[PDB]
Design a protein around this nucleic acid. Structure first.
Ligand SMILES: [Mg+2]
Ligand SMILES: [Mg+2]
Ligand SMILES: [Zn+2]
Lengths: 100, 199, 143, 145, 67, 49, 137, 63, 70
RNA sequence: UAAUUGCGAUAACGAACGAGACCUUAACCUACUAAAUAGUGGUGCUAGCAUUUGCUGGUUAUCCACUUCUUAGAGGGACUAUCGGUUUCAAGCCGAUGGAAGUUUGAGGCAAUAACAGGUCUGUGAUGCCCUUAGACGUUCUGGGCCGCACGCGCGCUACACUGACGGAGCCAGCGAGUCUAACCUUGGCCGAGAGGUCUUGGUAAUCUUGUGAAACUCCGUCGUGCUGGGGAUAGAGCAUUGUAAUUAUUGCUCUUCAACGAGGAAUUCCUAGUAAGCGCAAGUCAUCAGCUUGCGUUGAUUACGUCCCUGCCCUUUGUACACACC
């Protein structure tokens, strides 16, 4: 069996947590050893801009936010479990990177 | 008294804090009493403090300022002139130096000297725009006395050889003795001079 | 009774190690003294030309003792202050790199610091010995 | 600190390189009054002269003053770097000078004069009296009097 | 100020109107029962409803309340 | 028929409207500050505070 | 056994263990806190309860994250909370309450962290509430 | 400078153009069975002690 | 440099009989009472502290508090 | 009541929007889950000082245990709770206790109906109409200008100094950003007085830059109250960096010159608590260029807890010869 690490990145917190719980459940159902899902903190990609498309009026600024939450979950599993765990989490919105 | 030691040695000049009657590390707080009866409950001594740097909330309510140590109120009012906004460490060092200089010149318990200066320089009657002669509340009396003392020390120390600490010391000494050479006493005398001419 | 550099904090140890480096006679001075400002963000050279390099060396040695390996850039950032840019707002400016690098090389030649496997200079065994001796001497001479 | 009796042996404002130098100021800042030497240059020359900088300009000696003058007039010779000089590779001989006299004004006038003689834009701006370093003239430096 | 809006007051009134042999004059049990007998869509609003219900039943025991 | 445009405001343009001014280059959007307001929700930038 | 203190952003984690009266703040003794004027702010949680009072406990602090004054207050709260926690966990609830009385009766945020946080800055002026200078003509 | 102290037993209300003055019912410490109405500039509450130069001046509202 | 620059010794007995009429001594006290200039007040205080009549109150920089010998 | 928020009253009844509710964030939680991308201890290995074994340090694949700090998921927590007083009968209000937090808990985001001849045709391959369309008003290339200076005005930066300047020494943040078609954030070594150069390195990032060793600040010294060692405008000379290209100086660095300015007239701005003010930092624009802005944190006051006097706003009553609505 191989050492693997699954890195999950998303703006959708519900989808991210659903995928992380799916991975944890699929690990515990086969009784594998895993270092629990570590939550890499939300990168708030703040962007401040001017509301007006011109230069008139009260100088009102406007901040937009893009919250990038990250999870990482590393465990040990054979090639069959590795392939089925990378092919069980295709939830729309979560980026999944599996490294050996 | 009780010269016990521990692994990190902290000196007996610190260990003598509370074995006897409580005090600040140089000036006692029990031998301080305001020379009047109206400025009680608005000049705050006893409780005592080891340093006039209580980073405490005192402005979210109306009369909570009266519970702030009067030495710290003097420090906060020294914490002014714009260039010196902030610099509370500077202001508390100035207060320490001022207290030492007060004790050097006619020692008289420099905390007690500060209290006497405030009580003497609190204007009792002032004028309001309607002018009309009105009385002054004790809280405003304390606030105006502190403001006058600090401002006098500030503009005395401005552009002259003596430091802010010693200018404040002279101002507090003269105000406590009630002499007309202190700026705060002169200003309070002017405010009370136009109190009777506007009745 | 088990006294380290962390028992005298900021000025007594620094002045005593500067005095020790002065009396040891080993100067390691680059000849830049009297000429340099120690930072582009300064306005004047050090006031005491004889001994400012020794205080710098003592400070660098203590700074490398108190933590792990420290480099020339870290020392530059540490010793650089704000610069009066005229009618422009102040800003942090890094200190002189050559002075810090030559201080590091001087303490290397004396054997107080050594090159780290991970970069920068880490205090040497003899460096700790000398610094601990100075700390104990300062403590036993003046509380 | 010591005996400073010196009943008749203190120099009040004195003469140095055709410039009045106050004897009541510490040596370096007293010397900074000469046109061509500033704080850093005076500090460097006073440390090269082996003079005690902690004393006023009026009591040091009558000969180490001339030593400072010699060091000041010959900086590159007394172990002073070229980058410490106000006149490097000046315009016509490449030597490193330090104009320290009532001659820094002369050299400045020579530079301005050569610029306007060759009709360079800086020289023309100097002739008009306007700002020369690309500054905005719309709002600042109006009265100047 | 701390004036409760109609969204709070009417809901507390209805909760008392059909749950008197029920949650006592203690806010803790009032909110715990509100969780079960009302689909409030925020804990802040639920706490508001429970507190106003507690106050209303506390003043009920001094006599009937109009409405 | 061309002079260098490897830097400055003429090197890059809005990926939507091709405007050289008011460009937002943070995170590599390269989108005008007005076009970004028009289609910020699509990219995933929201307002919270 | 493990406690912490905060004032604005400085957190000081204190370990209170069984030992013999050793009070360290950053590896140095508490005599070495170095504001040089607020060094009694870090002595205050000692001089209130008992001057020596201790051949039994060792306090070792580590503070990071704020400023000089904020770190001073953070460690002064941390060691007080550590002493209270040690007395609650090991010695007795009576003593824990009895010295909590002194700490809270003289309270300068010794046991309760100050809730004042920097209010966010708004556009149209530097600072949270200060606005840029407005002109009319 | 005759000395006469009083204690505000009741705060009547704000007065003055800007509302800077508080009108208060005050009761003298000596001869406690007598009350006069006064105008105060600073912040004042009940059970507070005023020092007044002139003892008898029935203060009215300030327009 | 306006006054009391380097000598302050024509009346050097004012370093012995200066104790009366004042218990407070400082840099600005020396400058103000027509004896010693601020350019060497900081070293005259050190002289009198090392040997003389003044006793320190604290080791403060940017300030100096001295008292007469008791 | 902050509120057309409610108690109520009642030719209205029952509703809708807005307010509130809501969402984000900042406070606490020794509660759960889980962490060599966060951390802390007990053993290992292990330099120093002290030797009854302690102190501080080291050990980025060296051991185990844990989650207080940190992180972020699911939740808890406050609801003005309790207790008094005041409340026309109530909505509420005022104190004290408890509480992490009692002002809508702090800050925001969102935010109605009607409008304005408000701004934007120079954001748009949004656009009607008009003009132009091959000596073009399309587009591109070189050069210049947008910055140009008798003067007036607005936003600001730096100061007028000792509550300071300058030298050493102490050495504390938080919000963030960063390059695989490639040159971004750069540690470390070396050279240089500096700016900077060079040889490597880590990082596509809780991993490295970076603990962003920030500045104000603190300590100790020099200066000594004078346009001074305050102030740094103007100018001269040189050294570099970015760029195809620095002249009208892009900027940085060194030396020199060292102006006004001695706290500012009439006027006038912003602001109530971690706020004002001071202090710097990151991001944006960016090849280079902050005295700008957007945020962030560090130090941290005074004063008030009111009023309708000024300037305005909301509701009611009232008068009008106003309706472009008192300009
Ligand atoms: Mg323009
Ligand atoms: Mg008219
Ligand atoms: Zn666009």
């Amino acid at each position: 069996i191989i050492k693997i690490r699954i890195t999950l990145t998303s703006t959708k917190v519900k989808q991210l947590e659903n995928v992380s719980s799916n991975i944890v459940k699929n690990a515990e159902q086969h009784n594998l050893v895993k270092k629990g899902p570590v939550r890499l903190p939300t990168k708030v990609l703040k962007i401040s801009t001017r509301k007006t498309p011109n230069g008139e009026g009260s100088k009102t600024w406007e901040t937009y936010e893009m919250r990038i939450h990250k999870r990482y979950i590393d465990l040990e599993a054979p090639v069959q479990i590795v392939k089925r765990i990378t092919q069980i989490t295709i939830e729309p919105g979560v980026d999944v990177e599996v490294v050996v | 008294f009780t010269p016990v030691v521990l692994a990190t040695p902290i000196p007996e000049e610190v260990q003598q804090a509370q074995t006897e009657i409580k005090l600040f590390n140089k000036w006692s707080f029990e031998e301080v009493e305001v020379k009047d009866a109206s400025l009680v409950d608005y000049v705050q001594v006893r409780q005592p403090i080891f340093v006039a740097h209580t980073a405490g909330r005192y402005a979210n309510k109306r009369f909570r300022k009266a519970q702030c140590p009067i030495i710290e109120r003097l420090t906060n009012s020294l914490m002014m002139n714009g260039r010196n906004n902030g610099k509370k460490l500077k202001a508390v060092r100035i207060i320490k130096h001022t207290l030492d200089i007060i004790n050097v010149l006619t020692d008289q318990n420099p905390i007690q000297v500060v209290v006497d200066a405030i009580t003497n320089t609190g204007p009792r009657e002032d004028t309001t725009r309607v002018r009309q002669a009105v009385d002054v509340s004790p809280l405003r009396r304390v606030n105006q006395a502190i403001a006058l003392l600090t401002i006098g020390a500030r503009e005395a120390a401005f552009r002259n050889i003596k430091t802010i600490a010693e200018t404040l010391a002279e101002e507090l000494i003269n105000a406590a003795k009630g002499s007309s050479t202190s700026y705060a006493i002169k200003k309070k005398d002017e405010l009370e001079r136009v109190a009777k001419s506007n009745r | 009774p088990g006294v380290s550099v962390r028992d005298v904090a900021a000025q007594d140890f620094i002045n005593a190690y500067a005095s020790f480096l002065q009396r040891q006679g080993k100067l390691e001075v680059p000849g830049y003294v009297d000429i340099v400002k120690t930072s582009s963000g300064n306005e004047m050279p050090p006031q005491d030309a004889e001994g400012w390099f020794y205080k710098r060396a003592a400070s660098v040695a203590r700074h490398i003792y108190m933590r792990k390996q420290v480099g020339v850039g870290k020392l530059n950032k540490l010793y650089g202050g704000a610069k009066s840019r005229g009618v422009r707002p102040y800003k942090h400016i890094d200190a002189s790199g050559s002075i810090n690098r030559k201080v590091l090389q001087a303490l290397e030649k004396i054997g107080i610091v050594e090159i780290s496997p991970k970069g920068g200079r880490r205090i040497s065994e003899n460096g700790q010995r000398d610094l601990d001796r100075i700390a104990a001497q300062t403590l036993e001479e003046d509380e | 600190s010591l005996v400073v009796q010196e009943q008749g042996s203190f120099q009040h404002i004195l003469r140095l390189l055709n410039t009045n130098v106050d004897g009541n100021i510490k040596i370096v800042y007293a010397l900074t009054t000469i046109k061509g030497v500033g704080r850093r240059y005076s500090n460097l020359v006073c440390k090269k002269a082996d003079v005690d900088l902690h004393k006023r300009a009026g009591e040091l000696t009558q000969e180490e003053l001339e030593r400072i003058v010699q060091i000041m007039q010959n900086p590159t010779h007394y172990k002073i770097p070229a980058w410490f000089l106000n006149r490097q590779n000046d315009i016509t001989d490449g030597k490193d000078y330090h104009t320290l006299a009532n001659n820094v004004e002369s050299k400045l006038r020579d530079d301005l004069e050569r610029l306007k003689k060759i009709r360079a834009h800086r020289g023309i701006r100097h002739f008009w009296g306007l700002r020369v370093r690309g500054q905005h003239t719309k709002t600042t430096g109006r009265r100047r009097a | 100020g701390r004036v409760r809006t109609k969204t709070v007051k009417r809901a507390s009134k209805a909760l008392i109107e059909r749950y008197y042999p029920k949650l006592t004059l203690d806010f803790q049990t009032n909110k715990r029962l509100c969780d079960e007998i009302a689909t409030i869509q925020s804990k802040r609003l639920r706490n508001k409803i429970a507190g106003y219900t507690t106050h209303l039943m506390k003043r009920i025991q001094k006599g009937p309340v109009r409405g | 028929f061309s002079h260098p445009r490897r830097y400055g405001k003429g090197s890059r343009q809005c990926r939507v409207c091709s405007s050289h001014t008011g460009l937002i280059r943070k995170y590599g959007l390269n989108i005008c500050r007005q076009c970004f307001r028009e289609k910020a929700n699509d990219i995933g930038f929201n307002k919270f505070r | 056994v493990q406690t912490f203190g905060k004032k604005k952003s400085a957190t000081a984690v204190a370990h209170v263990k069984a030992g013999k009266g050793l009070i360290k703040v950053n590896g140095s003794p508490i005599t070495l806190v170095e504001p040089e004027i607020l060094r009694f702010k870090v002595y205050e949680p000692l001089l209130l309860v008992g001057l020596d009072k201790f051949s039994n406990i060792d306090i070792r602090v580590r503070v990071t994250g704020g400023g000089h004054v904020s770190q001073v207050y953070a460690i002064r709260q941390a060691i007080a909370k550590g002493l209270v926690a040690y007395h609650q966990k090991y010695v007795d609830e009576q003593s824990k309450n009895e010295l909590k009385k002194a700490f809270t009766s003289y309270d300068r945020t010794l046991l309760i962290a100050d809730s004042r946080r920097p209010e966010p800055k708004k556009f149209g002026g530097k600072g949270a509430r200060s606005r840029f200078q407005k002109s009319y003509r | 400078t005759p000395v006469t102290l009083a204690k505000v037993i009741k705060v009547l209300g704000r007065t003055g153009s800007r509302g800077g003055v508080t009108q208060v019912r005050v009761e003298f410490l000596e001869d406690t069975s007598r009350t006069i109405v006064r105008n105060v500039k600073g912040p004042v509450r009940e059970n507070d002690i005023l020092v007044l130069m002139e003892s008898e001046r029935e203060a009215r509202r300030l327009r | 440099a306006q006054h009391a620059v380097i000598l302050d010794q024509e009346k050097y007995d004012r370093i012995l009989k200066e104790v009366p009429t004042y218990r407070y001594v400082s840099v600005s006290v020396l400058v103000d009472r027509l004896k010693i200039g601020g350019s060497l007040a900081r070293i005259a205080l050190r002289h009198l502290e090392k040997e003389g009549i003044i006793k320190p109150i604290s080791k403060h920089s940017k300030q100096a508090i001295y008292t007469r010998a008791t």
